Amino acid sequence: LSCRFYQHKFPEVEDVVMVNVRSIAEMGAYVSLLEYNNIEGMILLSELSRRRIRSINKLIRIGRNECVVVIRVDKEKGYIDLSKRRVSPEEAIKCEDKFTKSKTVYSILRHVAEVLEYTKDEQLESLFQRTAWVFDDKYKRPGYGAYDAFKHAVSDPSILDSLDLNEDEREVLINNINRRLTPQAVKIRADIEVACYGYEGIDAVKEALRAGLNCSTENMPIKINLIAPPRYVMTTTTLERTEGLSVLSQAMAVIKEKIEEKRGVFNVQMEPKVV
Amino acid sequence: QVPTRKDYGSKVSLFSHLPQYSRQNSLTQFMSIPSSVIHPAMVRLGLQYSQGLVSGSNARCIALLRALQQVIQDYTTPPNEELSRDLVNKLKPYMSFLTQCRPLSASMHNAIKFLNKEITSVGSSKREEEAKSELRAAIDRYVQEKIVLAAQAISRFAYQKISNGDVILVYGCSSLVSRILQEAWTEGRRFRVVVVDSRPWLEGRHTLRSLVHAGVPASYLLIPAASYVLPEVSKVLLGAHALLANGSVMSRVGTAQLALVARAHNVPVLVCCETYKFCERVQTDAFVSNELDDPDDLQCKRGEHVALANWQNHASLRLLNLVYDVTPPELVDLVITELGMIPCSSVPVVLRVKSS
């Protein structure tokens, strides 16, 4: 049903780790290590904050997840002690990114297991040992390696095929990765009123529109439609919105230059934006 | 595990949430004679609480601390475990069972919190015998400084207020008040004492037995007649079972009545209590947090007939036996502690300075 995200069982010291608070005691706060198959953990009260704090409940908030560093580990007694004073905002950000990517990877693996109908928890543990943790061991970078490998598999299915799990299981995993690691959807729209009330009005307007549309490269066809008489909407349904905005800006600049050259009228009704 | 004590008799609707047991029903009837839950430091204290062998709050705290010293001495760590946390996790059932036998007081709550803090403060590297010895030493130091020295300092402070030829009114069996009066009489102060008692405990007679044994002139009367005797009373002195952060005084049932009538008769009111008894929790009435004792103690034999004999056979009839009540701060003029002579409004301030 569920297991630790990483093959490693006890996280090392000085490693920022996600926790979920469960209860409050005198010694400190009880948490579950969500990504280590919910092992019990402690946060000492003397380490909650650098300031003088009298109540644990001032920042415990049972039921709310948190990012805590590990200050001491004792594998013999199953005792892990954590901390909140040491963690920096940047460390929290990178740990949260790690947690999100690990959650995505585990969602993919859990979907694969459910598709395979592997009712045995041992079968799911073996699935973790074989399918996803192989890339984790290969890349020598826990967390990020699995997500990078899954992205590459969504790009090139060679990585997914290289796994030695099964044939039908490989197909199920590929389908799950495609349904999960390929959520590409974007449509950048903009509005601009291009019209020249001069001698060759319609001709100049058509020429400027064609010149602007000529800047639309492959996999980014800028289609211009006449929503109104004087205003025109340009739509480019392409991924990479960061580059799409620059492309739309370049097209708008080209259209404005073409309109100004022929002594016409060009107005930017709205900047490019997603739909 | 330990069973649950059965509530005895119907309760008032306003007090439906509080438990109410009977002295006849002892929980030990459902527990092993060679106590298998844990060692029987539980059962001795629990029986002496349920049967009311010890009543005074200081007496209860001392008995609990002695029993818990025995607990610590007999306790041994399990392999592959940490004492600083296992000790508290094991001690929590002791507190649960003790609450089942009889609800705890503020003094015992403070003692439990202090000992839990001490256990938590114990490091994970020190040896077992050293930890046990230092825990026992800490308990001894706590007892000493929080009871004996506090009582001596409070007696020294109260010696100033007690003037010659005056009348001092007390209430119930309180060790601090009796010791204060005895020490004041020792130093040559000449005065009278008026004792006010209330049913059904009638523990006020206790202090009377002290006062005659100290040669102090005394007088004794029940609570309702207090309004008759107050005009000749010059000072009212009351012990307290607890102090709250709002300045109110949680004490025996009759304390608030005496304070109110004393204010109505223009008589100063003194409340003597130790700092360790101060409790951070607050309440505005005796309904939210109290303790209902056995109602069967209410039955009395007047003439040859007991009116409340078969009270259970009347469905509409209800009996309540309150043991605690709250006196509002505005009716209190003194709190006498080892820190000195303070107003009630300064109760939280002490809680701030003793916490660190």
Add this chain to the structure above:
Amino acid sequence: QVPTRKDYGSKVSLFSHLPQYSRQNSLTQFMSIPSSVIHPAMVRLGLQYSQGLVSGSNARCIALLRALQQVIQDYTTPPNEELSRDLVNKLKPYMSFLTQCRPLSASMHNAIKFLNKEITSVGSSKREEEAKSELRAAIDRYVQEKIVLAAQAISRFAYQKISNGDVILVYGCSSLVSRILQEAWTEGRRFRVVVVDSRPWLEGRHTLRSLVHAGVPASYLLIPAASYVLPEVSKVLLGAHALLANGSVMSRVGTAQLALVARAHNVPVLVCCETYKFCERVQTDAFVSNELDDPDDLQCKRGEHVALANWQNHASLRLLNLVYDVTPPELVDLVITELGMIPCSSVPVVLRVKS
């Protein structure tokens, strides 16, 4: 037989001993169109009580006495009978029906008692027409000398207590207070008046509309803001719907609240009332005997919604709108009657001297 009125809505547990009728439900649906069980004057008066067309205590008493005069004029004794007790026996169901339409007040209770005492005192040797004329004359004399002359004397007495430049606070709608203020202003005094109102009747706008028409400066505000304006108030004048024997003042809902807040602000409180409203019964609070109005009056359309529209649909929801409450005597300083200005504890003495 007269049918009983059915209670509307679920009443509060503490007020289970009081009725609660809706304005929509009227008994006339189950009565003969040509009135036979009761006199047409009685049914008309009950209709205009149950619909709230008459609100003032003095107005209610005057209307009741006029309707009773109409009935007396229309009455005819039966054979083998005499007027003295037959009249009262015939009148009792009319009073029961009137109570069914809306609970009686102190003024109506006193008027009924006085009329019963007068009818019972009618000699047997009296002739029917002569007895009817005498009853009509007695009712007219009672109305005159117990409302008009009483109000004139009360206004004359209260004129002295009002000085130039002071601020007077009133509450609700009451003919006596408005007459006092208008006559005091007419006599030459100069002052401001602060009007305090309350939901849902909002009857204060009545007396305000009078004061503006008299040229008196005025100010208006709801009851909760009274504590804001009491620092600048010098005197408090209230109208009382009933005076109890123990000195308690049985009046409109907000009277006791205003008296308490005024006493906290150290402002004298004045009460003007007529002797005929002095009841002999006593009550220590507003729970033992009160009046429950239509609960649907509490609904107010704030914004675009009525938050209490389907209040019945919530099982654990109850609405409560009292009409009367009791002010303890310690919060009152004056009772102003035709007898003069008396302490609030002298009410029983007057009760003794009027019999």
Add this chain to the structure above:
Amino acid sequence: PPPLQAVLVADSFDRRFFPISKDQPRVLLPLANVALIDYTLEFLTATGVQETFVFCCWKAAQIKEHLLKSKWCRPTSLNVVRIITSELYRSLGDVLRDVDAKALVRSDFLLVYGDVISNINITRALEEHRLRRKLEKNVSVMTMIFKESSPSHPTRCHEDNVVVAVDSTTNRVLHFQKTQGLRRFAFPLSLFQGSSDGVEVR
């Protein structure tokens, strides 16, 4: 939904303020030490107007100078103000004809004089007007704003009293007229022949 716009005429085409108007525009008179233009601009800004056009003909120089120093003319204001000057203006009809000639408005603009004191949020009325337009397919062209008031109020001066007759079901105006000096009012039969369900005279 295009951004909302509002036209703000800054000249009353009527000489009701001689000799005050002879040396100061009416729109610039201080009501409470604040110009009426400031009041109406604040009201427009409050109700969410993002573009406001002010037309000024009489003594437009003073209005220009005063407005350019106002808060609304600051670059931080969300109410973009555009000032138009034309001495050819003689009535509001000329102003609207000029607006149509230059086609500043796109759809659903606000018409209001420069001496209007108000704090009305017309979001509800705007939504109702747009819904009526959408369902009825461009039949309704105007939506007046009216406030309930007793006829005895001082604000209802005899110069600007108006009586209206509308359908109470859809707020569809049927008749509208002034009541200056008229002791009786007239209503054509047509109002009843169409809306047989009911008519309310206000």
Add this chain to the structure above:
Amino acid sequence: GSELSERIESFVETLKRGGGPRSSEEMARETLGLLRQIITDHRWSNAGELMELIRREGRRMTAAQPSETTVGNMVRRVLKIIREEYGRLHGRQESLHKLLTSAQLQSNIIEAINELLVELEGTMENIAAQALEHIHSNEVIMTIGFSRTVEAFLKEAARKRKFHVIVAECAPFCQGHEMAVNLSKAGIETTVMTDAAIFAVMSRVNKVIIGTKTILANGALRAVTGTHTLALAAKHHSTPLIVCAPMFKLSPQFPNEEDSFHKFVAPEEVLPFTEGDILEKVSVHCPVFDYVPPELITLFISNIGGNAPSYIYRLMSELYHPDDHVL
């Protein structure tokens, strides 16, 4: 930054024009976020420079709407945090003892502000967790107006206990009716009354639980209109009164140090415009805030526990600096 100025202008316009955000908790969170952005996205070298900038922004925001004190309280809290951080990073209270005995700051300030937001998040649950110890079975609890804190308090209390709640509508803004439905949606057997009847019913009320808008230094309160009357009735009947108030509602000001303490709105709500002629002479006042003296307050409940009014001066002294009461 341009966007910083844009957000500041939007915030001050929203505060000065009407309401927003709906709950004072959201307003405090937005103020703290704006102050954090000011501290981060601005240039400053000395602590004095940052304090002067914060003081100017706080003066502007307070001048936007004086009746709203939460923004000022947050600004003063930030100023106190800056003072403490500078003092303990450079060196190491105004008491008698003091009388008789004479580079990386920004990250620490940001961390402290984040801690402040974290403890702001759970304030309502911290208050509501201790409801069970203040309510007994078959109690009668009376409430005025609308308050989310009291709503959550009563909902948490009613989970394991049965009692009766009587709510008085706060005319003219009859927001108590929301209680009337909301508690009814939880099945708490509530009753609705007009606020002209408090004293009349007050003798049958075991306890009164109310919220508040502001807490002053001496322990007074700024509450909804009519709360002074309710407190007076409670004192008359000696019924204990509870003020469920979060920690961030302690203004270090004093009652009579200023005016405009009351907030006046259009008299349309009290008296509708349709009256006509009588409005031409009648003066109408509609204050929406009332002053409650500390004598009538029995207990304060906050996210840190219960307290007496007489102790308020300490808490105000533990969150602000005396030299910042002028701002």
